[PDB]
């Protein structure tokens, strides 16, 4: 009994797929959704239909102004302002800030005031809000914190992998590269982008050397690896799934077969679920729907020697991350209401 | 005597290429450009680097605060209010309206007001402004018209074909389908499009059924075929170039051999440069950068009997259409500034 | 009261997806496969992981030199000469020819030579073998026919619809187009295509116009439409699913809504499972893994008048067809063992 | 005086752009082509039409069963057996082996057999044949060397950069990843690929881990870094232009500015034409048609510290390589003739 009641503000890509993960894992209960740029009737469409993840494997309709999903009514809102959503009346405790526009404790506090929702969870790396990665520092969550962060989805891939290698071979220093699928933030043709010019170029016809602090933010998830990690991104013409290309220096001399054994041991043990291990000839479509945060590709990895190796790990940047959002809630609820 | 002095508002896709089309024909003069979102710095980049048509053939730079393009200086503005764009100062007598917002004559007249833009040229269909398709209703244009429209890119492909077939076999009735490359109006991944839900889907993994106002608009350019034409569109994962698929009944008998030689005589004849004829094994990429408005494909056209055929005409939806913007001005300036 | 014993020749994308359909429907028992390019280990890989239809839904492994799927054992062979495949020892009574090398009756008699397979179904449209379409002329199968084809997948889409529209309102004539996905017969980059130059172009870069008799082949399954139907094909950068574009002149006039009503009933009638009817804002990726032969889109298709209408219908060119292959065999098992 | 007379075996993708780059640079003279699968008529269409690089810039016709290009004549052959090709009658001194079937000194000598061809160049890396990268070790060519290799596209990118680095700051140890466009060896959809399973997968649906022997191969070109550097590749859905992602440890402490200057100086100096330096916010498609082997991207490269950095260099994996083949030939005809 006593499941966590959850609400969502920002029904984007990384906000609808989080909703999918909820009815799958069944670890929490969604009760509310708010998005002013999306109509209610539209919402059923975007849930039922998805070009990446297929149609919803349940029942979706409308009960009397409420979105019924797999036999569960959810109230819908559409306030331009985030502090104009009455979470209390829906019974929501934890709000998911997936609009990605209120990524600060000051802005996200707009959900918490007037006693409405207790904790706010930002589905992006935050500057002031304490970021968390379910693999590593999910336990660092103290009850006195309201607005958290689940870091970036590249971070959710690298950080768990970094922990294993570092804790077992000691990562002296490393540089990361993520071959990232394109995201909502890109253009179908050479369009406007007054800030990030490269990010405006046609998404299908370009390899776009983007940037990311995800690897640099691994330091915030793993403090022992602070300033020892950073890296950039390549955004390539694929709808979903991404891979991390880590190259680093280990403290202990270890052969690749040794590395494999440790990772295989982690993905089976304490990281059963966050980290996964395979030795198959996979590509970036064998992971569409993977709940894991990192899938170590043993085969594609290469070792120059025993102190300098290149590692590769996949992740569903959309759905793996979505699941880790659902996990962070369960943990909190487990921690605040117990 | 002189060349027409031209200005451009809305440095979009179908706007930057119109510019690129001016330094090629060199039939007119671009003097001013206006776009609030895209600064001068950015304008150079957007012009110089293009994922579809390649790097600009020439030296694009800045000088003394204004934009320069192979020894010609272009004044630059960032006014969000068309009424406050100073065309009068710049010397812009002709303005191309490529923002998508302004379509009404009384709307496009915010450019004309108060001693600046002589004629307003809307690079999009207008349901009140007299639409005109060069090569068809070209000379049908009157000097007493303050705002005109060039209609859609697609309709600029069908009409020059429609005319030929009509003016020789008389098109009884016909339905058109255009397999269209995606446009800036779409989403790279499943996104918000409250009006047109299907154009909210991932443009790169989907064949998206649309509906265009290009086919009946041929009735607006060719009155004889008014109401005899209509048809919808298909958006597919290519960055540029589209093809018209015209299915129609004829009034007179036709051997497809005749229709061929009819088009060939119209391509090299009066419609030289507007309508083109080909027999080659062409594919969409074979028309990137093409200046033709319609390129009839001989072998790809199918014919059921002597009266009911299916024609096929290619076009660069971006660059072919941007040329007819330029040519129209040479016609106006002929008629409208003399 | 028995089940068909099925063998597969040609382990391409139809061959594998036919197998998936067999375990999804569980109406036939696949007992053998043959592909001189694909060994036992690889087959597992190709069955397990699939870029388009995701991972195999069930159990696949190997055992005692035999492929094992969901508990059923499947012999594996690598014969390049079809007359060298031991269909008798394998107990395969029905052989699926999907190599394309054997489409004629006599080139198909290899599997039947010297008491072996009883029947052979050609997944490719044939020149002499009796072509059929499930939902149109299933019951036209005689027990004496050794070779028999299942038309094309393009053919299997338009055929059910025609037996509705023409069956009710009569299309005096009609032309067809199919915006097809790309198939394994194509090239990643510009390459060789000796006899059909257009097909050897960048499949991801291009819209490729290709001829197809799959619309002329309608006359074979519906004699009444012999010479009344024919069409072409466009191939676009999408991995799977295609749409049929039918522009036909109807004898008995009907409004765009009257015809919708006709197709409704057909979806819930005897073709319940063949012809489907939808009214949703659908795009191509919605019908991935769909078992229908033809899904009519009421929102897409439009009508010029009452006698001249355009219809749009979707189909999974890979999986939908594979489903019909299965349905045909289990039907054949009914007759031979009646 | 005399210009290099060249023949091409295998008019595939790479052998077809070599011809292109030849007439572009006009530094050598192509006199003979051979490809059994491509006849004269087809050969012309493959030149006039390119999905990636557009139409060829020149008059290409056929004079008397012979291919005429820009006024230069080229005799064609469809000899499957390279030892049957009359390179002597054609007067081809330097032959380009562009089919991967003849990549050893014994297997390549069929061109030189019986006094015709006097030098042969392998468009792919070779086992025993000495490889060369123009700008790095083209001066190690000896008049005695009858058969050579130009390594691979990727090697020609990594090497000019590595030379600069290792010479200025010394690369202690290094690892490389190349985000590479797909090539003719891949499939449009999941197809057979017995030796390399991942490459069987649909080229345009997946990110595909592959292996390149182009990083250790630098070791054969620069022994100083043999065993000290290696790497792999990710295959992504793009038609052309790849990028190299080089992570390495510098023996000398170097700041990023200090690195930026290191490359800018060599791109203007002796590596002018080979290595290029840029600071613009570019993407892959900005390099289609680039005649450079390596284009250093400053804004995309990063530095963890003064001794651990990540460098990025673009390259047209199709046409940058073909230009170097022409330079390898021009260099030999010099040395060969003296």
From Swiss-Prot, chains A, B, C, D:
Enzyme class at the top of the EC tree: oxidoreductase
Keyword Membrane (UniProt): yes
Reaction(s) catalysed (UniProt annotation): D-glyceraldehyde 3-phosphate + phosphate + NAD(+) = (2R)-3-phospho-glyceroyl phosphate + NADH + H(+)
GO CC annotation terms, alphabetical: cytosol; membrane
Family (UniProt): Belongs to the glyceraldehyde-3-phosphate dehydrogenase family.
CDD domains referenced in this protein's UniProt entry, alphabetically: GAPDH_I_C, GAPDH_I_N
UniProt-annotated catalytic positions: 153 (nucleophile)
Positions bearing the site annotation: Activates thiol group during catalysis: 180
Gene3D superfamilies: Dihydrodipicolinate Reductase, domain 2, NAD(P)-binding Rossmann-like Domain
Keyword Oxidoreductase: yes
Protein's organism: Schistosoma mansoni
GO BP, sorted A to Z: glucose metabolic process; glycolytic process
Protein's job: This antigen is associated with human resistance to schistosomiasis.
Annotated keywords: Glycolysis, Membrane, NAD, Oxidoreductase
Annotated positions binding D-glyceraldehyde 3-phosphate: 152-154, 183, 198, 212-213, 235
GO molecular function, one term: NADP binding
Protein name as catalogued: Glyceraldehyde-3-phosphate dehydrogenase
EC number: 1.2.1.12
Sequence positions that bind NAD(+): 13-14, 35, 80, 123, 317
Pathway: Carbohydrate degradation; glycolysis; pyruvate from D-glyceraldehyde 3-phosphate: step 1/5
Stored InterPro entries: GlycerAld/Erythrose_P_DH, GlycerAld_3-P_DH_AS, GlycerAld_3-P_DH_cat, GlycerAld_3-P_DH_NAD(P)-bd, Glyceraldehyde-3-P_DH_1, NAD(P)-bd_dom_sf
Subunit structure: Homotetramer.
Subcellular locations according to the entry: Tegument membrane
